[PDB]
Design a protein around this ligand. Structure first.
Ligand SMILES: *[C@@H]1O[C@H](CO)[C@@H](O)[C@H](O)[C@H]1NC(C)=O
Lengths: 50, 100
């Protein structure tokens, strides 16, 4: 759910990197926010294989 | 007193070091900028979350500030209680006016 106050003539929301982050549902005039799913980096710690 | 560590404060830093740390403003310290913080959605999207969402990350340094402060305090104590003797071998005691 989005707390942004869209103007009645606006349909999309963009960010700094020019990607859509807020959307309006075509059926119900409701504002939604899109967030990328969880991600991260993995490191492996090991001694020598001998 | 202005350069020795202050035991009253938790981080044990001298007043001059306190002023130096307060003067410099840091953006990201390599701490845990948790994905929960970015998904908090406080309607104020900073540049850090935008950088994180595109594959750019910042790693923390190996040595913390407390360890560097400890090293500085050890150097100060060595140069005050011994002079230049501890830099070439065992530390030898000497009164400060005689050293000066
Ligand atoms: C579109 O149809 C659905 C199902 O009949 C209805 O619930 C919805 O309100 C309609 N959309 C609009 C904008 O009226």
């Amino acid at each position: 759910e989005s707390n942004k106050k869209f103007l009645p003539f606006q349909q999309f929301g963009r960010d700094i990197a020019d990607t859509t982050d807020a959307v309006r549902d075509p059926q119900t005039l409701e504002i939604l926010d899109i967030t990328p799913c969880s991600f991260g980096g993995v490191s492996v710690i090991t001694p020598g294989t001998n | 007193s202005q350069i020795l560590p202050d035991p009253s404060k938790p981080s044990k830093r001298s007043p001059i070091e306190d002023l130096l740390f307060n003067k410099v403003t840091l953006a990201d310290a390599g701490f845990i900028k948790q994905y929960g913080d970015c998904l908090g959605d406080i309607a104020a999207r900073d540049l850090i979350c935008a950088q994180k969402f595109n594959g750019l990350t910042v790693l923390p340094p190996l040595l913390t500030d407390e360890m560097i402060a400890q090293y500085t305090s050890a150097l100060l104590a060595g140069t005050i209680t011994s002079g230049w003797t501890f830099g070439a071998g065992p530390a030898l005691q000497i009164p400060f006016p005689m050293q000066m």
